[PDB]
Amino acid sequence: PAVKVKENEPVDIAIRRFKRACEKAGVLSDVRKREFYEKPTQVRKRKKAAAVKRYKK
Amino acid sequence: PRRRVVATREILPDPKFGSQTIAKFINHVMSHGKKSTAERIVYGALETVAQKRNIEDPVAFFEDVLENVRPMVEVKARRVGGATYQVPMEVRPSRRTALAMRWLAEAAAKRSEKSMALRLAGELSDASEGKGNAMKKRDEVHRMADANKAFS
């Protein structure tokens, strides 16, 4: 998640590009999973429910 | 009222000065329907201040003082996630005028002078020169927003 900003460029647009890069790399979800431990059975059940939702979509 | 917005009633401008704001101010001073008393009190106070300041246009002086008095930003409470915190928001144009008029009336209520007209004239003078309880109240309203200024 490294972003390079060109010379004489607004700060806000670079900030927005950095946010897009972080979203593309999916950094936040890793930290969200890390913050709290989750039971493996709960993980498996959630994965199955997500799979069913994806199938309906 | 979770219902359509409706046009506000058209106010009747005052005769002597022919100004909307003056009658709107007289409305708040009016109590128990004594518009005749409010007219006299307001005219007396305005005449006293105008004589003291040797200004030809009391209506213009009143417009300047009211514009100074009105607060730009007022804090409004908001509920998010079962929590209550202050939120600074820009005040509505008409609400600024209404707030200033109400605050001036309230302070004129507690001014020392024996007669209401003299209390009101003193409060207008203090408001014009940025002193007194009305200016303190406006400063407090601004201060509450300035203290946190962490929302919106």
Next chain:
Amino acid sequence: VSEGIAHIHASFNNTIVTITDRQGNALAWATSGGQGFRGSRKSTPFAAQVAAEVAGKAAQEYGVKNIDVLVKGPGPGRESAVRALGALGYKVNSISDVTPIPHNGCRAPKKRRV
């Protein structure tokens, strides 16, 4: 010292911004508690912005004209700190995220029930 690297330890509870040289030495640091914001007021982007401004000034006395940001942690004020640097006028060569991503190295705390 004519080049600077900024480290931001942002976190939901609190955000810390510090200014360091290229070699890896921290000239000065700023914190929200020093500003005095507490609790919910402390954990807000503006509380991050003000401390970022203070740290930027502190670095200005040292004399670094160019600084590059290194954000760490999923704070809500990480954007506001970079906005604060931009408003101060520090020029940023690049924006990078150095958040640690541990690959199930250590067990996380038990889930909280409310």
Next chain:
RNA sequence: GGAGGAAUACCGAUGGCGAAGGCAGCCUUCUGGCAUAAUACUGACACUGAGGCUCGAAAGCGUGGGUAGCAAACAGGAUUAGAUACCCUGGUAGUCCACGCCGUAAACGAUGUCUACUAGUCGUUGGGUCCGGACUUAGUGACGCAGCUAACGCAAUAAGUAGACCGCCUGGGGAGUACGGCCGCAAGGUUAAAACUCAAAUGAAUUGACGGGGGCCCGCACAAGCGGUGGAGCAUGUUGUUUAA
């Protein structure tokens, strides 16, 4: 800059393997199954299974090591009327390794194993054969006929039509409890009653109601303002008391 333990993000997918329980970084050694390919072979060697034995999550136990994170127990901080809890700051056993016990889980597909038969459709994993598609195989899911079911629903991975064998059930409690065997170091597991007690205990589904479940919407319901009750005196009604009432 080191030292030490555990786990193996992304890949990752109602994906894959295993009889179940279960099994995730990477290379090596040994190792059991399954899938398919055309030949060559034995020629009923088959299915099921009382006892019996093998394995069998997590926790727990014994000896010996290791001990980062987390964390029963324990300490202190909070809300609370109290909080031997939920939140919190720490935190020992345990979880990690070697060798043995324990043999229990909502050990579930709440669905014993093995056969033959019974419309179709789109998926997806491992092979095969054909000209990116069509065809066929053993698993892997989502819909949907006949058929079955109290209804949910099942529906070639049957809960449909038949067959072989095994296990289990006979109202709800008392109770998977007591006694006696058997096992275990222990915790306790396994087999498994009776006295007594009540007319119920239940399953599916329907109509309502309710939720500190959701979606939308309305009323001076709140918001924003105006001025009142609650404080004084008095009029009025009512309890209360006193009265013959």
